[PDB]
Amino acid sequence: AQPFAHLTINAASIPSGSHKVTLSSWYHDRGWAKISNMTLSNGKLRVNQDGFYYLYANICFRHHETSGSVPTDYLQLMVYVVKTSIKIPSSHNLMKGGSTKNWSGNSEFHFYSINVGGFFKLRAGEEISIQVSNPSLLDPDQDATYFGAFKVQDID
Amino acid sequence: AQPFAHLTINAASIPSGSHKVTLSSWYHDRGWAKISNMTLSNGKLRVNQDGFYYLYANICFRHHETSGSVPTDYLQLMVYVVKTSIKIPSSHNLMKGGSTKNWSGNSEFHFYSINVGGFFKLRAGEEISIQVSNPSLLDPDQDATYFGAFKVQDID
Amino acid sequence: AQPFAHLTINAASIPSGSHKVTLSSWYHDRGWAKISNMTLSNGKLRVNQDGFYYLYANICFRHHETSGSVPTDYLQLMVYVVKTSIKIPSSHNLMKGGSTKNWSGNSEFHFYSINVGGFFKLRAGEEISIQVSNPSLLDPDQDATYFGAFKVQDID
Structure with missing residues (x-):
């Protein structure tokens, strides 16, 4: 059926x-x-x-x-x-x-999440990738760090 | 038609x-x-x-x-x-x-909002709920605190 | 086909x-x-x-x-x-x-982004607009500031 993807971070991809x-x-x-x-x-x-x-x-x-x-x-x-x-x-x-x-300094823990979303026209062959700063601070959990896509309608 | 929900906070559920x-x-x-x-x-x-x-x-x-x-x-x-x-x-x-x-100290007024979204596979009978920390700080307005869902396609 | 919009900021609209x-x-x-x-x-x-x-x-x-x-x-x-x-x-x-x-005033650079999304029932003739505080601090790039819409289904 219609294309889609929901991807969770694999803790390997983090220097x-x-x-x-x-x-x-x-x-x-x-x-x-x-x-x-x-x-x-x-x-x-x-x-x-x-x-x-x-x-x-x-x-x-x-x-x-x-x-x-x-x-x-x-x-x-x-x-x-x-x-x-x-x-x-x-x-x-x-x-x-x-x-x-x-x-x-003088705070035991610090946390912060970012979310983005948008509707885009995509062609077969095109690739979507994610870049981030400070990747060594990423939260590895699957409910935490992810990205995805899902087709809404055909080119028009 | 296709299922969906957009639910707004009822100021009661706030200890x-x-x-x-x-x-x-x-x-x-x-x-x-x-x-x-x-x-x-x-x-x-x-x-x-x-x-x-x-x-x-x-x-x-x-x-x-x-x-x-x-x-x-x-x-x-x-x-x-x-x-x-x-x-x-x-x-x-x-x-x-x-x-x-x-x-x-800073200013008698502090505010911060969070938003999350994602594409998930769901089966009849499963339930989606929401948990938050510091629930007593929630903004009660319908445009500030809410959660929802909408079917995009059938299971495949 | 089904309606949609993805609009990007025109740096003119910034006082x-x-x-x-x-x-x-x-x-x-x-x-x-x-x-x-x-x-x-x-x-x-x-x-x-x-x-x-x-x-x-x-x-x-x-x-x-x-x-x-x-x-x-x-x-x-x-x-x-x-x-x-x-x-x-x-x-x-x-x-x-x-x-x-x-x-x-300390760090030489400051940045902050916000995103919101939701499912709404709309009738022909209704209009969606964006209001923000501190508009002079807006980032003018098309990947930074935008808003949009896409019809999911007919009224019911």
Whole structure:
């Protein structure tokens, strides 16, 4: 039936840096993770069926004093949903979300989630990927960090 | 026709504590609140028809110095969208969102909202409910705190 | 086919005030901005076909110390999705989101994004618009600030 995907983060895809990076490991076969009529290729969600899709992502970041220090008090926690063309490899942000945070001292725990959503016209061959800042602060739970898409209607 | 629900907060389901609780009272028949081919049973949204639904929630929290003061300098405003099943009961988190906030001195007025959304496969008999921390800080307005769902396609 | 819109901010509709305003200039014809069987009239999205629609908005605010300073150390960064009508002079709030935030001159860069979404029953002639506080702090990129709608089903 109509294409779709709901992907949960695989805790492998997370270095120990602050640099913005493409998340490359997502489950598509366990818990809430599912996919149909679309292809997952190392963090790249390829469209197989032309259409107007509703796209979305939810990203939680967290930090507990107990787990150690971090280079700085002030973080830029951002999420970018990117479209890339297998044909014309031009790459652009479909959506952006996030917040600057002062997780400064004398607080045992800090947490913050970001969500984005939107309706976009997609062509088979096009790929959707997720980039985030501070990926070492990501919350690994499946109810926490995910992204997905579902076709609403055909190209018109 | 296809099932759906948009439920608004009934200011009754609001204790005076900071412990996380399931919100049990939502309207389904005034203002923007509505429901069709779905059943609301004391805070639980039961699925009637099997399908792939888009689920969402928006939750607003606020605080006035005039109202008094916060339980602590550092607060944790969170939302959890929980799924349950007839027999074989088992609370399962579908999504979570939130932030840690320092609500003190600053301005007699503090506010923060959270939103979560996602595409899930659902079976008749399963129930969607909402839990939040600091429920006594909820914004009672129908445009501030609500949750809902709408079927997108049949199970496949 | 079924109606929809995805509108992106036109940097014209941005005053230099802190006063809450209705954003009056959106693109419907370039980049990801698109519209089908809905009509844009200076900031309001008119519904032309009765239906149950999914509505959404993403708003991003940001500040560069190089741009000068913020009107207050503690800012109210809010968005309200409002419904008005071609006929009556009413004005109804459908969703609200936002946060109070300290951008107290220290860090050289501040950013914060908000997103809201919901399922609403709409009649031809009703119009959707966006109101935000601190409009001079809006991020003008098409992936940062937008709102839209897509019909899910006919009225019932």
